[PDB]
């Protein structure tokens, strides 16, 4: 999902998102700590990266040790 | 905001200052080559990173560049809110 | 004081264009006819006084120039800044009709004509924070 | 179990170890490097052909690549 | 030939497999021809033939040939293929005919390979198929 | 007329035209005697 | 006159001049159709949508007669004739080299080749189908009849083309179409029915020498056979003269369900169905205003239709329907789509032909089929809407119209959207993966089926009631119910299932709410790319710009996957897993609780054993429970006679991997390598000289999504193929 | 020969890692299209559609494609 | 090195730096760049023309 998709599309929808909080009654008390903002080129390549790495390394583990002491 | 660069190339066609939206050139005058009046940026504090400029520069090895650098605020970033 | 012929929209001013910014276009069209604004919507004008209140440096240059001089030809438009206080700045029109390249001498800030076959170097410029300019 | 876990294990650790010294590599190159002082030293002449080590490069893995292929589906 | 490996035509089980051999084409003796043609290699516990590759006479020419052969045809296509390559651009059509072949010239092309080994050896002595590292002007860097 | 080879050769029927040439020569032979090992 | 096809670029004045780069060759397969990017008029445009038309004619007809050649001197028909079940039809017989020799589909009688799975013989047998020199004769015509219009639409383009004010008279269009085409056409099939079809399938009860029985001239003037049977058939007694129709009750009756002696339902019911059928829409068709003064002026009824709410109503559409074209094909598309769908999800409780219950190999094929093709062109559908907002609109003739009004709040609507798509989505899911969590936890009493926390759809189960006793009051003149999975008895034959009532418990709530989840979002990307088309609050130029362009440079941060039909890609990602987990599901049911085989006290004992209410609650289960059945052959599925088409899912993987690597990398580093190699191919003087360049980030996402979406459904056509010839 | 196969099966992989690798490092300064990246830095730098699109040409998009390939080889 | 001489480029960072291209025009004016050169080699959207300072210019025949 984070590979795949691009940053030119998880904006638009957060426009209209920030829309909400402005119009509502009885919450738009709260307002904002800082102005959020889509995420970044890099580090959206640097969050896909580390989720398919850590996917990659937990099941192969799992599969190895279950079999070995499950087989002998 | 971010950084523009200007190099001795300009022939002097001004497609950029036609191009760029956002009102960041200016031809100041020159005596070099038949142009007489080169491309420059007085104004960058409006840059956006669109950099429709330099596609419209028929230079080869396009005269203008943009370092695109990394202190943006609301104006460069470009918000409506 | 004129405004366009419009029955309301959704994408219009917000919390910050009137806590940080405004911006306001105006011309003279002595004619009425069908136009589009980027915020969507399609309107008539009417003679003469042309006011309009926006919040981007994009929707107001973008009929300045498509809309106004490349097809309906006026070119007596003013643009504004407005800063959060309620005073304006006069950015632009500076030379008339934009044209960008004529003048009788120009502004002088800063110059840079250098090829680029001598850059600036990592190892060679260092400890300290100027840029790849000055040589 | 514990020798096989530990065979991976430790295999794991050292794959992408190298993938960090390659990259510390990289970004020496573009940081801590002087070009005249070390102007015609063995560095420069191998910058000078680099060319066809990475062409040779491509070309025996697409000769092992196609090949060990073929046999499998053969 | 070692490694433990039993002659294909003693191994008990090759003609084991050989007696049921599915003969694979419409000719009854498909099957068991082709074990008979497998004779002439050892087999093993698989009961199938390993290849032996080192010029040794047991199995030199099952793998000697073929690779001339293969290096036969490929110097064949890669030298027609150059040759036409050179030719088309003395005509000054170079992108117009990159993609109408002109038949009446690329025949006679191809059914003139015939000698280019040797062919090829003159224009290595005579420096005839590489250009100058400079003069080759594809800049690097 | 023969000016149909004119708008014939155009490479790509020419390409599959001698693919197929070249496939039907390696069946005949895998055709006629696929029994030489 | 042969002196014109080798002049390429004949369309295009920009790539007509010569083959620069590589480039020249991609956009040469990809503008040869838009001719509306050719020139402002339209009859050319018009003369050119015909004669495409005629041409997929021609080909239509084409394949179809070819596909008869072989079912008659290669296809085991007319011994499959006399038994329809010991019996598995089959054709395209395997062709005697190396390599294709073992793969003779044996399927009795000696008939080796191919066992077939498109039930073609089905419909041959109920169009009573004796010898196949009458087929050979039908595939003659056929052809002839392809090749005739195919020189009609050469005719009507280069000699006699029509005029410009033949198009728009869309009241002449519909009545025609919708009178003279479909109901003369139903009627006329319907006659042939009553004439032969009904006829011969009475002789098809005993075994009543199929040859032998006569043919249809023994029937133009003989009614004395046709006076056998239905003796108010004697000639008709022609009693419509006297306005009398009771006579008639022998062959027009309605009887509405399973007839256990054909394998489908009574035909009768279908001939009066398509008499009825035709007179209606016949009198329907009559509707609209012609050359006799006469009718509705229909763009004055969308006028009328206005109010508070409305605004302005319809006003002003008929521009957009006529002068436009772009709009009108996504109209019908989408139309189109919906429709084949339920045609899918139609034809599997009320089996229109004879022997298709009974046959458990065509139905899901069929099914699936279709319904793959529904959503695969609906989205296409949606994207020519797209491409109409772009290409055609006007702000003058679209002042606060019905459509205009949502262009102006699109905000709203979108966002209440987002809102409806995160409640359903984690509504759903997490509470299943809750369940999961449960269940691997040792709290069984956490879960969520009629044995744990309940929840029940009361709703299907009291519509489906409210159906079961429908006949007497509802429908008095109607024997049987519509169907029996609602409601009535378990139909059957033989050991094997035809239809029984289908049972809703707990676990049909969150597939359906999962369902709807997804149809939900897909909406959200494709509607979200329809209003912000023209103008994003951001981008004031698309529209400005085009719909198919990568991004607006780096800008704003990052602006790629800006356009449309990257909304359309994602979206079509979308309905893949829509459709892939909705085939999963029809699957696993009709095989798990509705089909099976039979003993003679109708106990039907299911292929499965009824898995949902055990093991379609938690994920692990759903992998466990479907695919260990749906693939456990797969493996050793080869290596006997009708056994060795091994099958290529082992190779859809491949082009699927393939696949994955086009969409995750750039193209500077393939133009780099490609660079290289030309300084090697440079040095050694080889180097073309039309100069290889990198493919563009718009080819190269489609070619990915392309190879992504044809390795998928390979793999599943696959998966499911083998795993019905192992029941089959 | 199953021994035979996987090892070549090996050899393989570690040619194209270090290919990619290599390329990467050697590419830390300039490309033959894009030579002046040596100042943009170990960094962003996407220049955008100059040509079809210039999008992972950062010095260390070579980082995630020798990551992958390290990793199917392990 | 005349009008319609095939002549070698000595600009580093040009896109045929060592290429050969023919001069179209030969100018000769107060312009740092006068010599006019053709090629028919592509750079970006073809700038198979361009000009140099014939300082930066050596023939090959
Ligand atoms: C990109 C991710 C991101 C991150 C890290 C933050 C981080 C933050 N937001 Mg926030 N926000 C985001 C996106 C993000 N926001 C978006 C997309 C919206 C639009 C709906 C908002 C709307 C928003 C509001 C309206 C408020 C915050 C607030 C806050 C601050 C405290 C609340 C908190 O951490 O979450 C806690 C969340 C849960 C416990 C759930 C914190 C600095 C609050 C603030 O101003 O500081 C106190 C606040 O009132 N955010
Ligand atoms: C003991 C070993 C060791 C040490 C001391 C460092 C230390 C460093 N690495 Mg590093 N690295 C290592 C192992 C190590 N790494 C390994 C094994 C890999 C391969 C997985 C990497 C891959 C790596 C990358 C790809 C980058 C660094 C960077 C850095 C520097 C910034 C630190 C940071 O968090 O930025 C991390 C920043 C990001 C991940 C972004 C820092 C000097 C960064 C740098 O030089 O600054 C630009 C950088 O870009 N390293
Ligand atoms: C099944 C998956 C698959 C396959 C078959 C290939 C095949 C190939 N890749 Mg590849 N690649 C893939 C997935 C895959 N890739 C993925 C997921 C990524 C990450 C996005 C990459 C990233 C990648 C890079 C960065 C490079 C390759 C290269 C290559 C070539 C290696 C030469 C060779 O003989 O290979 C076998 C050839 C065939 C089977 C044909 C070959 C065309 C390299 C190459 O040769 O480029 C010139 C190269 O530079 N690929
Ligand atoms: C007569 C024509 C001809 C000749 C002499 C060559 C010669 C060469 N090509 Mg080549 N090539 C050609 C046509 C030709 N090619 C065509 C038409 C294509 C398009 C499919 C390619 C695609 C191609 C690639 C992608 C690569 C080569 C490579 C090579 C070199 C390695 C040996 C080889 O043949 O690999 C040819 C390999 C294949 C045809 C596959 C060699 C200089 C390789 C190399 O390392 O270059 C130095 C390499 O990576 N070529
Ligand atoms: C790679 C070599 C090879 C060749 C030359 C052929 C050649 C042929 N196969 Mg074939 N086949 C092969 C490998 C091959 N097969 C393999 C490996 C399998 C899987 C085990 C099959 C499975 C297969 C089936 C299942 C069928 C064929 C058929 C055919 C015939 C028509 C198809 C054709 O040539 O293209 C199309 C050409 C024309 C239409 C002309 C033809 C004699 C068909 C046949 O015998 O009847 C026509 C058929 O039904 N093949
Ligand atoms: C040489 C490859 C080859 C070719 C040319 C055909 C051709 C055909 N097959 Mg076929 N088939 C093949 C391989 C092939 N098949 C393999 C490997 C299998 C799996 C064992 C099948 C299983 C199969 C079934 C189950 C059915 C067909 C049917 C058909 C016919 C429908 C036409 C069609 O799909 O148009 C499009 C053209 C292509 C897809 C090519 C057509 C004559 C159908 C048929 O006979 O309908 C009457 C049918 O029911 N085939
Ligand atoms: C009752 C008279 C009648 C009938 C039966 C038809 C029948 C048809 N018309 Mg048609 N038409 C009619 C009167 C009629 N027209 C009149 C009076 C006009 C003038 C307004 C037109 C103008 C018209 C146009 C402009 C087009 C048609 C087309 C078609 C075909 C639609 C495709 C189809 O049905 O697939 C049947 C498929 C199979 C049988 C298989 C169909 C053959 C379309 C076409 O080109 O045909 C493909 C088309 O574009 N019609
Ligand atoms: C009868 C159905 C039908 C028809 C007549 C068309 C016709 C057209 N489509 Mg289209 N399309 C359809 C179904 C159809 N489509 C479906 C079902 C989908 C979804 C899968 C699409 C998705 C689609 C896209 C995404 C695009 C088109 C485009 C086009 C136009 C150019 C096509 C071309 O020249 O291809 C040449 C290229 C190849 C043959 C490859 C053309 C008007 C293109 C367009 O906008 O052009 C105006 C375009 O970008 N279509
Ligand atoms: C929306 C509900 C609904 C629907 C769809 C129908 C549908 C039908 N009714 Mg029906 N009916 C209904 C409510 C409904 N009824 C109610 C509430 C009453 C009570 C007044 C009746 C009383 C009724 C009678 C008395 C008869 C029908 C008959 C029929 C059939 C007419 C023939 C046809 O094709 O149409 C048809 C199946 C007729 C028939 O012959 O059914 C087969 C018939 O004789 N209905
Ligand atoms: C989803 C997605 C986003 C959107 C991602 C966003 C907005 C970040 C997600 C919001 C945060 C990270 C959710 C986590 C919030 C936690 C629940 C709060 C933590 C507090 C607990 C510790 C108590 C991008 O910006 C993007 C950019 C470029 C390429 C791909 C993508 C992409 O795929
Ligand atoms: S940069 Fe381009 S547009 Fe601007 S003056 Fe130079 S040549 Fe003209
Ligand atoms: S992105 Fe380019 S066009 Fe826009 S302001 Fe910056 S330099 Fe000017």
Redesign the pocket.
């Given at each position: 999902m984070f590979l795949i998709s691009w940053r030119g599309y998880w904006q638009e929808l957060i426009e209209t998102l920030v829309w909400a909080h402005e119009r509502t009654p009885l919450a738009s008390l709260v307002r904002w700590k800082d102005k959020p903002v889509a995420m970044s080129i890099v580090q959206g390549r640097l969050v896909g990266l580390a989720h398919f790495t850590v996917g990659y390394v937990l099941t192969y583990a799992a599969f190895v040790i279950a079999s070995t002491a499950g087989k002998f | 905001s971010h950084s523009v660069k200007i190099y001795d190339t300009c022939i002097g066609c001004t497609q950029c200052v036609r191009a760029c939206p956002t009102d960041v050139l200016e031809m100041v005058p020159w005596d070099g080559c038949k142009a007489g009046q080169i491309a420059a940026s007085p104004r960058t504090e409006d840059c956006v990173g669109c950099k429709r400029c330099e596609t419209a520069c028929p230079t080869d090895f396009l005269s203008i560049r943009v370092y695109l650098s990394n202190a943006e605020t609301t104006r460069s970033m470009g918000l409506a809110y | 004081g004129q405004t366009p012929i419009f029955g309301g929209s959704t994408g219009g001013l917000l919390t910050k264009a009137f806590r940080e910014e405004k911006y306001v276009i105006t011309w003279t069209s002595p004619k009425e006819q069908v136009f589009e604004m980027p915020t969507g919507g399609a309107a008539i004008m009417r003679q003469g006084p042309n006011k309009l209140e926006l919040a981007r440096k994009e929707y107001c240059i973008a009929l300045g120039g498509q809309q106004l001089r490349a097809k309906f030809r006026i070119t007596d438009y003013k643009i504004y800044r407005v800063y959060p206080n309620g005073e304006v700045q006069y950015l632009h029109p500076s030379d008339g009709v934009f044209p960008e390249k004529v003048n009788e001498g120009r502004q002088k800030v800063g110059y840079v004509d250098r090829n680029i076959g001598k850059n600036p170097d990592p190892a060679k410029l260092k400890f300290s924070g100027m840029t790849t300019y000055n040589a | 179990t514990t020798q096989a876990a530990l065979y991976t294990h430790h295999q794991y650790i050292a794959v992408f170890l190298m993938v960090g010294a390659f990259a510390h590599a990289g970004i020496f190159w573009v940081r801590d490097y002087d070009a005249e002082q070390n102007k015609g030293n063995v560095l420069d002449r191998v910058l000078q052909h680099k060319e066809a080590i990475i062409?040779h490069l491509?070309?025996v893995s697409?000769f092992l690549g196609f090949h060990t292929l073929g046999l499998y589906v053969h | 030939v070692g490694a433990g490996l039993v002659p294909c035509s003693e191994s008990p089980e090759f003609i084991q497999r050989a007696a049921s051999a599915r003969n694979t084409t419409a000719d009854p003796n498909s099957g068991q021809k082709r074990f008979e043609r497998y004779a002439q290699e050892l087999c093993g516990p698989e009961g199938l033939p390993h290849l032996i590759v080192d010029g040794r006479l047991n199995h030199a020419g099952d793998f000697l040939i073929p690779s001339i052969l293969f290096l036969y045809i490929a110097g064949w296509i890669?030298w027609v293929?150059?040759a036409y390559?050179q030719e088309i651009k003395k005509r000054d059509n170079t992108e117009l005919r990159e993609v109408i072949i002109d038949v009446p010239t690329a025949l006679p092309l191809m059914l003139s390979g015939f000698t280019w080994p040797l062919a090829a050896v003159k224009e290595l002595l005579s420096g005839e198929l590489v250009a100058k590292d400079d003069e080759i002007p594809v800049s690097p860097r | 007329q023969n000016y149909l080879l004119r708008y014939l050769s155009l490479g790509p029927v020419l390409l599959f035209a001698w693919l197929s040439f070249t496939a039907v020569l390696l069946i005949v032979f895998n055709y006629l005697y696929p029994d030489l090992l | 006159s042969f002196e014109k096809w080798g002049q390429p670029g004949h369309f295009d004045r920009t790539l007509a001049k010569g083959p620069k780069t590589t480039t020249w060759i991609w956009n040469l397969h990809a503008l040869a159709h838009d001719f509306d990017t050719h020139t402002s008029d339209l009859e050319d445009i018009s003369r050119k949508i015909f004669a495409a038309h005629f041409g997929q004619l021609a080909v239509i007809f084409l394949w179809l007669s070819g596909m008869e050649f072989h079912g008659a001197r290669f296809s085991n028909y007319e011994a499959w004739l006399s038994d329809p079940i010991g019996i598995k039809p089959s054709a395209q017989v395997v062709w005697p080299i190396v390599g294709q020799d073992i793969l003779n589909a044996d399927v009795g009688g000696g008939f080796h080749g191919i066992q077939i799975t498109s039930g073609l013989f089905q419909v041959w047998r109920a169009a009573g189908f004796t010898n196949s020199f009458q087929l050979y004769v039908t595939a003659i015509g056929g052809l002839v009849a392809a090749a005739l219009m195919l020189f009609a639409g050469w005719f009507h383009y280069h000699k006699r083309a029509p005029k410009l004010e033949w198009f728009q008279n869309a009241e002449s269009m519909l009545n025609h179409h919708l009178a003279g085409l479909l109901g003369l056409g139903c009627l006329s099939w319907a006659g042939h029915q009553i004439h032969v079809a009904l006829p011969v399938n009475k002789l098809l009860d005993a075994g009543v020498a199929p040859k032998d029985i006569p043919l249809p001239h023994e029937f133009i003037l003989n009614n004395s056979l046709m006076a056998e049977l239905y003796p108010s058939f004697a000639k008709g007694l022609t009693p419509f003269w006297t306005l009398n129709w009771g006579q008639y009750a022998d062959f027009l009756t309605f009887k509405g369900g399973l007839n256990p002696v054909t394998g489908g339902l009574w035909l009768t019911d279908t001939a009066h169905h398509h008499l009825a059928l035709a007179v209606l829409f016949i009198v329907a068709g009559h509707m609209y205003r012609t050359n006799w003064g006469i009718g509705h002026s229909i763009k004055e009824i969308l006028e009328n239709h206005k109010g508070p709410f409305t605004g302005d109503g319809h006003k002003g559409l008929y521009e957009n329907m006529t002068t436009s074209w772009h709009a009108q094909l996504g109209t019908n598309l989408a139309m189109l789509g919906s429709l084949t769908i339920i045609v899918a999800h139609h034809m599997y409780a009320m089996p229109p032909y004879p022997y298709l219950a009974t046959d458990y190999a065509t139905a899901l094929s069929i099914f699936t089929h279709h319904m793959w093709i529904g959503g695969f062109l609906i989205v296409g559908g949606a994207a020519h809407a797209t491409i109409f907002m772009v290409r055609d609109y006007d702000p003058a003739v679209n002042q606060n119209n019905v459509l205009d009004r949502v262009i102006r709040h699109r905000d709203a609507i979108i966002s209440h959207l987002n809102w409806v798509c995160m409640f359903l989505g984690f509504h759903s899911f997490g509470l299943y993966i809750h369940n999961d969590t449960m269940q691997a936890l040792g709290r069984p009493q956490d879960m969520f089926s009629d044995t744990a926390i309940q929840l029940q759809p009361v709703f299907a189960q009291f519509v489906q009631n409210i159906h079961t006793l429908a006949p007497g009051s509802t429908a008095p003149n109607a024997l049987e119910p519509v169907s029996y999975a609602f409601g009535g008895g378990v139909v059957a034959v033989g050991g094997k299932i035809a239809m029984m009532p289908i049972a809703l418990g707990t676990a049909d709530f969150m597939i359906h709410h999962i369902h709807a989840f997804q149809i939900h979002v897909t909406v959200l990307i494709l509607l979200k790319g329809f209003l912000f088309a023209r103008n994003s609050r951001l981008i004031p130029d698309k529209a400005n710009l085009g719909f198919r362009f990568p991004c607006d440079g780096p800008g704003r941060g990052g602006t790629c996957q800006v356009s449309g039909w990257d909304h359309v890609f994602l979206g079509l990602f979308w309905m893949f897993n829509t459709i892939a987990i909705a085939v999963y599901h029809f699957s696993w049911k009709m095989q798990s609780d509705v089909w099976g085989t039979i003993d003679p006290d109708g106990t039907i004992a299911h292929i499965t054993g009824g898995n949902f209410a055990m093991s379609a609650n938690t994920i692990n289960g759903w992998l466990r429970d479907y695919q260990w059945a749906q693939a456990a052959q797969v493996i050793q599925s080869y290596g006997s006679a009708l056994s060795a088409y091994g099958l290529l899912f082992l190779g859809a993987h491949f082009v699927w991997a393939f696949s994955l690597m086009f969409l995750f990398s750039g193209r500077g580093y393939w133009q780099e390598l490609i660079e290289s190699?030309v300084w090697?191919?440079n040095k050694?003087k080889?180097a073309?000289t039309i100069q290889p360049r990198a493919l563009s980030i718009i080819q190269g996402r489609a070619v990915g999504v392309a190879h992504y979406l044809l390795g998928a459904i390979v793999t599943i056509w696959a998966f499911f193929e083998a795993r019905i010839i192992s029941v089959g | 020969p199953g021994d035979f196969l996987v090892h070549h099966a090996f050899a393989l992989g570690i040619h194209t890692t270090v290919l990619v690798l290599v390329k990467g490092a050697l590419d830390a300064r300039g490309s033959k299209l894009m030579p002046d990246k040596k100042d943009f830095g170990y960094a962003f730098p996407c220049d955008g559609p100059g040509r079809g699109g210039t999008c992972d040409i950062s010095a260390w998009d070579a980082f995630y494609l020798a990551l992958f390939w390290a990793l199917n080889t392990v | 090195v005349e009008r319609g001489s095939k002549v070698r480029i000595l600009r580093k960072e040009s896109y045929w730096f060592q290429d050969v291209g023919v001069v179209a025009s030969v100018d000769k004016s107060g312009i740092r760049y006068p010599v006019i050169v053709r090629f028919d080699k592509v750079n970006y959207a073809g700038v198979n023309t361009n000009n140099f300072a014939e300082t930066e210019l050596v023939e090959i025949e």
């Open positions: - | - | - | 062409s491509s070309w697409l | 890669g293929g150059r390559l | - | 190699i090697a191919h050694l080889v073309p | - | -």
